[PDB]
Design an enzyme around this catalytic site. Structure first.
Site, PDB file in Angstrom:
ATOM      1  N   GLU A   1       1.178  -0.119  -4.797  1.00 20.01           N
ATOM      2  CA  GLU A   1       0.185   0.860  -5.227  1.00 20.01           C
ATOM      3  C   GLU A   1       0.804   2.260  -5.260  1.00 20.01           C
ATOM      4  O   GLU A   1       1.035   2.844  -4.194  1.00 20.01           O
ATOM      5  CB  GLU A   1      -1.000   0.895  -4.244  1.00 20.01           C
TER       6      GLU A   1
ATOM      7  N   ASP B   1     -11.028   2.293  -4.091  1.00 13.96           N
ATOM      8  CA  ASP B   1     -10.762   3.712  -3.913  1.00 13.96           C
ATOM      9  C   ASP B   1     -11.343   4.570  -5.033  1.00 13.96           C
ATOM     10  O   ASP B   1     -11.051   5.778  -5.112  1.00 13.96           O
ATOM     11  CB  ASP B   1      -9.251   3.981  -3.902  1.00 13.96           C
TER      12      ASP B   1
ATOM     13  N   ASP C   1       0.801  -1.224   0.000  1.00 21.08           N
ATOM     14  CA  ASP C   1       0.000   0.000   0.000  1.00 21.08           C
ATOM     15  C   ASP C   1       0.833   1.272   0.000  1.00 21.08           C
ATOM     16  O   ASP C   1       1.865   1.342   0.664  1.00 21.08           O
ATOM     17  CB  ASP C   1      -0.824  -0.011   1.313  1.00 21.08           C
TER      18      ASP C   1
HETATM   19  C1  LIG Z   1      -6.978   6.541  -1.229  1.00 19.61           C
HETATM   20  C2  LIG Z   1      -5.611   6.782  -1.835  1.00 19.61           C
HETATM   21  O1  LIG Z   1      -5.279   8.142  -1.557  1.00 19.61           O
HETATM   22  C3  LIG Z   1      -4.113   8.650  -2.169  1.00 19.61           C
HETATM   23  O2  LIG Z   1      -4.327   8.729  -3.541  1.00 19.61           O
HETATM   24  C4  LIG Z   1      -4.363  10.064  -4.103  1.00 19.61           C
HETATM   25  C5  LIG Z   1      -3.223  10.266  -5.087  1.00 19.61           C
HETATM   26  O3  LIG Z   1      -1.984  10.247  -4.379  1.00 19.61           O
HETATM   27  C6  LIG Z   1      -3.352  11.629  -5.766  1.00 19.61           C
HETATM   28  O4  LIG Z   1      -2.384  11.770  -6.787  1.00 19.61           O
HETATM   29  C7  LIG Z   1      -4.772  11.830  -6.308  1.00 19.61           C
HETATM   30  O5  LIG Z   1      -4.983  10.947  -7.385  1.00 19.61           O
HETATM   31  C8  LIG Z   1      -5.388  11.491  -8.649  1.00 19.61           C
HETATM   32  C9  LIG Z   1      -4.492  10.828  -9.695  1.00 19.61           C
HETATM   33  O6  LIG Z   1      -3.147  11.250  -9.513  1.00 19.61           O
HETATM   34  C10 LIG Z   1      -5.012  11.177 -11.096  1.00 19.61           C
HETATM   35  O7  LIG Z   1      -4.292  10.448 -12.072  1.00 19.61           O
HETATM   36  C11 LIG Z   1      -6.480  10.691 -11.180  1.00 19.61           C
HETATM   37  O8  LIG Z   1      -6.929  10.985 -12.459  1.00 19.61           O
HETATM   38  O9  LIG Z   1      -7.222  11.461 -10.241  1.00 19.61           O
HETATM   39  C12 LIG Z   1      -6.852  11.094  -8.906  1.00 19.61           C
HETATM   40  C13 LIG Z   1      -7.874  11.711  -7.971  1.00 19.61           C
HETATM   41  O10 LIG Z   1      -7.745  13.125  -7.894  1.00 19.61           O
HETATM   42  O11 LIG Z   1      -5.731  11.620  -5.301  1.00 19.61           O
HETATM   43  C14 LIG Z   1      -5.713  10.253  -4.811  1.00 19.61           C
HETATM   44  C15 LIG Z   1      -6.887  10.186  -3.853  1.00 19.61           C
HETATM   45  O12 LIG Z   1      -8.138  10.215  -4.557  1.00 19.61           O
HETATM   46  C16 LIG Z   1      -2.923   7.749  -1.877  1.00 19.61           C
HETATM   47  O13 LIG Z   1      -1.822   8.152  -2.664  1.00 19.61           O
HETATM   48  C17 LIG Z   1      -3.228   6.262  -2.071  1.00 19.61           C
HETATM   49  O14 LIG Z   1      -2.105   5.521  -1.623  1.00 19.61           O
HETATM   50  C18 LIG Z   1      -4.490   5.857  -1.323  1.00 19.61           C
HETATM   51  N1  LIG Z   1      -4.838   4.486  -1.362  1.00 19.61           N
HETATM   52  C19 LIG Z   1      -4.357   3.534  -0.423  1.00 19.61           C
HETATM   53  O15 LIG Z   1      -4.027   4.114   0.813  1.00 19.61           O
HETATM   54  C20 LIG Z   1      -4.860   4.018   1.915  1.00 19.61           C
HETATM   55  C21 LIG Z   1      -4.237   4.303   3.249  1.00 19.61           C
HETATM   56  O16 LIG Z   1      -3.727   3.110   3.837  1.00 19.61           O
HETATM   57  C22 LIG Z   1      -6.193   3.315   1.925  1.00 19.61           C
HETATM   58  O17 LIG Z   1      -7.160   4.177   2.537  1.00 19.61           O
HETATM   59  C23 LIG Z   1      -7.641   3.800   3.791  1.00 19.61           C
HETATM   60  O18 LIG Z   1      -7.513   4.915   4.671  1.00 19.61           O
HETATM   61  C24 LIG Z   1      -8.101   6.104   4.154  1.00 19.61           C
HETATM   62  C25 LIG Z   1      -7.718   7.216   5.126  1.00 19.61           C
HETATM   63  O19 LIG Z   1      -8.089   6.911   6.469  1.00 19.61           O
HETATM   64  C26 LIG Z   1      -9.618   5.954   3.972  1.00 19.61           C
HETATM   65  O20 LIG Z   1     -10.071   6.928   3.017  1.00 19.61           O
HETATM   66  C27 LIG Z   1     -10.336   8.260   3.347  1.00 19.61           C
HETATM   67  O21 LIG Z   1      -9.246   9.097   3.051  1.00 19.61           O
HETATM   68  C28 LIG Z   1      -8.918   9.172   1.659  1.00 19.61           C
HETATM   69  C29 LIG Z   1      -7.646   9.982   1.566  1.00 19.61           C
HETATM   70  O22 LIG Z   1      -7.802  11.311   2.034  1.00 19.61           O
HETATM   71  C30 LIG Z   1     -10.101   9.834   0.934  1.00 19.61           C
HETATM   72  O23 LIG Z   1      -9.742   9.956  -0.449  1.00 19.61           O
HETATM   73  C31 LIG Z   1     -11.309   8.918   1.096  1.00 19.61           C
HETATM   74  O24 LIG Z   1     -12.464   9.504   0.511  1.00 19.61           O
HETATM   75  C32 LIG Z   1     -11.596   8.691   2.573  1.00 19.61           C
HETATM   76  O25 LIG Z   1     -12.633   7.751   2.761  1.00 19.61           O
HETATM   77  C33 LIG Z   1      -9.925   4.666   3.185  1.00 19.61           C
HETATM   78  O26 LIG Z   1     -11.323   4.398   3.360  1.00 19.61           O
HETATM   79  C34 LIG Z   1      -9.134   3.470   3.713  1.00 19.61           C
HETATM   80  O27 LIG Z   1      -9.383   2.392   2.822  1.00 19.61           O
HETATM   81  C35 LIG Z   1      -6.611   3.005   0.495  1.00 19.61           C
HETATM   82  O28 LIG Z   1      -7.731   2.135   0.483  1.00 19.61           O
HETATM   83  C36 LIG Z   1      -5.392   2.411  -0.196  1.00 19.61           C
HETATM   84  O29 LIG Z   1      -5.731   1.730  -1.381  1.00 19.61           O
END
Ligand SMILES: C[C@H]1O[C@H](O[C@H]2[C@H](O)[C@@H](O)[C@@H](O[C@H]3[C@H](O)[C@@H](O)[C@H](O)O[C@@H]3CO)O[C@@H]2CO)[C@H](O)[C@@H](O)[C@@H]1N[C@H]1O[C@H](CO)[C@@H](O[C@H]2O[C@H](CO)[C@@H](O[C@H]3O[C@H](CO)[C@@H](O)[C@H](O)[C@H]3O)[C@H](O)[C@H]2O)[C@H](O)[C@H]1O
Ligand SMILES: OC[C@H]1O[C@H](O[C@H]2[C@H](O)[C@@H](O)[C@@H](O)O[C@@H]2CO)[C@H](O)[C@@H](O)[C@@H]1O
Ligand SMILES: OC[C@H]1O[C@H](O[C@H]2[C@H](O)[C@@H](O)[C@@H](O)O[C@@H]2CO)[C@H](O)[C@@H](O)[C@@H]1O
Ligand SMILES: [Ca+2]
Ligand SMILES: [Ca+2]
Ligand SMILES: [Ca+2]
EC number: 3.2.1.133
Length: 686
Positions: free
Chosen positions: A256, A329, A228
């Protein structure tokens, strides 16, 4: 072993709490009482799915064509609420990386599921979350558990008693998610109003603790990990951790790295990570285009073909990219576009395209749902008769039996805005795939050329998705009509008459590690395998798979070659490290003034540091970096280097215009740490 490559597999991603409640007795344990919702109406509470539920549904998963289950995180999560009806049901808020989450089972339950999956020919990869522990508020230690971390029940520390331990970073919350220093050293935030305590992978105790936890999952049978948030912790630790895991077993690793599509500022860093870390990546570049072509219809087949070409040129191991249409996500595909034919088309695309498809649980049962948490509904049914179920099962069989899907090139054969006919080819094995996304228009297809041998080909899907038969003569397909919204697949496969390597995996390791060569035409009689001309000891030899031990040879990227019946195969690269790695913070103090776009890199006398290269492209083992500069004019970053070794290195500035300005004087000399981590700090030589 079969764990090294997943090129012939279908991955199925399961959110454990939302799949199947196989044991109602662990729904609301005293250890974490009050986090369970029996009504399945409070979307961030535990609903009761568990590891025994996944094991009970192995027959369903086998019939669907699943050959690797990606389990959402299984380790002990936060035992309290984190605000209103909000819990670690998803598994990403870990309080103890050495114990299984009690709502899901115990180590015996995990062992039983993994053992039973393996008996059914199904591998298990585990989602592992090294970036952080649990939710906290900096101004209130009573919120949740204050970031508390335990070691198999023994308290280690939290965000508030860390002064003399340094288990966590204390740099504030991420503000700019695209700033690389913030994204890695500042806290992950959740819009509910809390942050996640950011672990310090540069701290030796934490680095070894996380390594030990990952190795424990592999000791218990895991066939690999989905790591992750790899863009949120230093990439030196990803490479060093992968080293340790490949020493244990030839498992599969994927990280990821969310987003950062082609053309974006952080895209090249992600490509370099995929090409050098030893960790493959989830295919977000292709995901974006899949959703716009089949879902929102804002992009066309030209864009889809362009992204296949772009990713094919950038990723060294593009056949290790893990593709997907949706996930936990982002909104479910059917909430983007409710047309089931468009969903069937998107699935057929990833089932037959390069890399390995990951299907989000319940896609085949037509689950719909907006973004988190509404895309994590309970698996509604286990109906083996849906069109999507049948499609996945059929195409999963093609991917297991036709080497063109596993290892082949990709060639565009016919295209317009709505239609994409492409061809996979691996030596004599060929698969021609036609996809028409337009559900209201048929297209007359003329001028289609192919590598299929002469003959008549029935649709491999038997018309399930509107496919038709074709006639091939001397590379030309007779004109035919492609039906509205159709998917048609025509394939040819045959035995090989010479050794053909499709895969060598893992892609990195040290002398003595087990490495697997998958392909065709190796024969049943043991031949020879060389790495850069050096004979390797064979562990096992079959017609399609050879296991070898990496030879005790010089480090660097080298070519693997199979010789069978005196005939040699094609070559496949493999990166031999200089020894077990350590993850080291390299800091260079008082560097010369720089302007926007100028960046500092590290280079040195070992392949881990680029063997004095100043190249900063996506190549393997070139200059390391770039370094970051939160403490400008001091620069730093974290790199994986052989442990306990004396190395020579220098830093250089790569100006915005491409010019190179080296440090002056003699090379810096240092001995690397023997443990998991360490620091090497020097002053720029003017
Ligand atoms: C969820 C995800 O968040 C980050 O991802 C962001 C990314 O870094 C940004 O660049 C951008 O993405 C852009 C992308 O670059 C573009 O190409 C695309 O076209 O558009 C995208 C959207 O604008 O934004 C995304 C976020 O949308 C991060 O980098 C990832 O690693 C991450 N995923 C993984 O990490 C975690 C943490 O272990 C898991 O989440 C768990 O914990 C979260 C926080 O407690 C819970 O989610 C909440 O927070 C999120 C982050 O603020 C909110 O987006 C979400 O609505 C909220 O519920 C989540 O429920 C829990 O599972 C991910 O599952 C895991 O896969
Ligand atoms: O005939 C060889 C030609 O086939 C394909 O071209 C298609 C084109 O993609 C369609 O849009 C339509 O115009 O028919 C053409 C065939 O007559 C390949 O895309 C092209 O590369 C190839 O030369
Ligand atoms: O090319 C191998 C060579 O790389 C480095 O030499 C640098 C030198 O440090 C710079 O001051 C400038 O002269 O460019 C050289 C590369 O052309 C290493 O310092 C040296 O040990 C190594 O052999
Ligand atoms: Ca349960
Ligand atoms: Ca727990
Ligand atoms: Ca971090």
């Amino acid at each position: 072993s079969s764990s090294a490559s997943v090129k012939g597999d279908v991955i199925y991603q399961i959110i454990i709490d939302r799949f199947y409640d196989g044991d109602t007795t662990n729904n609301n344990p005293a250890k974490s009482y009050g986090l369970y919702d029996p009504t399945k109406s409070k979307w961030k509470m535990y609903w009761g799915g568990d590891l025994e539920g996944v094991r009970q549904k192995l027959p369903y998963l086998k019939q669907l064509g699943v050959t690797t289950i990606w389990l959402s995180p299984v380790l002990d999560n936060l035992d309290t609420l984190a605000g209103t009806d909000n819990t670690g049901y998803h598994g990403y808020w870990t309080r103890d990386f050495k114990q299984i989450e009690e709502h899901f089972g115990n180590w015996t339950t995990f062992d039983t599921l993994v053992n039973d999956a393996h008996q059914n020919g199904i591998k298990v990869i585990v989602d592992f979350v090294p970036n952080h522990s649990t939710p906290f508020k900096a101004n209130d230690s009573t919120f949740a558990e204050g970031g508390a971390l335990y070691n198999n029940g023994t308290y280690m520390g939290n965000y508030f008693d860390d002064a003399t331990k340094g288990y966590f970073h204390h740099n504030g919350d991420i503000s700019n998610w695209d700033d690389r220093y913030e994204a890695q050293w500042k806290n992950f935030t959740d819009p509910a109003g809390f942050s996640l305590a950011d672990l310090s992978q540069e701290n030796g105790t934490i680095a070894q603790y996380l390594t030990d936890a990952a190795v424990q999952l592999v000791a218990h049978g895991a066939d690999g990990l989905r790591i992750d948030a790899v863009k949120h912790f230093n990439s030196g630790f990803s490479k060093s951790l992968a080293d340790k895991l490949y020493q244990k077993k030839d498992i599969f690793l994927v990280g990821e790295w969310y987003g950062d599509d082609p053309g974006t500022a952080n895209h090249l860093e992600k490509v370099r990570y995929a090409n050098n870390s030893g960790v493959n990546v989830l295919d977000f570049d292709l995901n974006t285009v899949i959703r716009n072509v089949f879902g929102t219809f804002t992009q066309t087949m030209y864009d889809l073909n362009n992204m296949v070409n772009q990713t094919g040129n950038e990723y060294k191991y593009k056949e290790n990219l893990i593709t997907f249409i949706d996930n936990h996500d982002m909104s479910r595909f059917l909430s983007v576009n409710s047309n089931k034919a468009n969903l069937h088309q998107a699935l057929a695309f990833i089932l037959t395209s390069r890399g390995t498809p990951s299907i989000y649980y319940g896609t085949e049962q037509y689950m719909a749902g907006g973004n988190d948490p509404y895309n994590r509904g309970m698996m509604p049914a286990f109906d083996t008769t849906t069109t999507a179920f049948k499609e996945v099962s059929t195409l999963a069989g093609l991917r297991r039996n036709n080497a063109a899907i596993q290892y082949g090139t990709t060639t565009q054969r016919w295209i317009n805005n709505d239609v994409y006919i492409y061809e996979r080819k691996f030596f004599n094995d060929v698969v021609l795939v036609a996809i028409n996304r337009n559900t209201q228009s048929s297209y007359s297809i003329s001028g289609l050329q192919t590598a299929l041998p002469n003959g008549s080909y029935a649709d491999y899907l038997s018309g399930l998705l509107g496919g038709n038969g074709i006639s091939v003569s001397n590379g030309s397909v007779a004109s035919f009509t492609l039906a509205p919204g159709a998917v048609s697949v025509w394939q040819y496969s045959t035995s090989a008459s010479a050794p053909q390597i499709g895969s060598v995996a893992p892609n990195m390791g040290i002398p003595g590690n087990v490495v697997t060569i998958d392909g065709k035409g190796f024969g049943t009689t043991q031949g020879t395998v060389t790495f850069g001309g050096v004979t390797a000891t064979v562990k096992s030899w079959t017609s399609n798979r050879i296991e070898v031990y990496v030879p005790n040879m010089a480090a660097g990227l080298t070519d693997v070659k199979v010789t069978a019946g005196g005939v040699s195969s094609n070559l496949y690269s493999y990166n031999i490290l200089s020894g077990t790695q350590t993850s080291v913070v390299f800091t260079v103090k008082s560097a010369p003034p720089t302007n926007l776009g100028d960046k500092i890199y590290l280079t040195g006398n070992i392949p881990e540091l680029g063997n004095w290269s100043t190249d900063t492209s996506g190549a393997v083992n070139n200059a390391q970096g770039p370094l970051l500069a939160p403490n400008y004019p001091d620069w730093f970053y974290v790199f994986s280097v052989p442990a306990g070794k004396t190395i020579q290195f220098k830093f250089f500035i790569k100006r915005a215009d491409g010019t190179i300005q080296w440090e002056n004087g003699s090379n810096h000399v240092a001995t690397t740490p023997t443990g998991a981590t360490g620091n090497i700090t020097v002053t720029w030589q003017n």
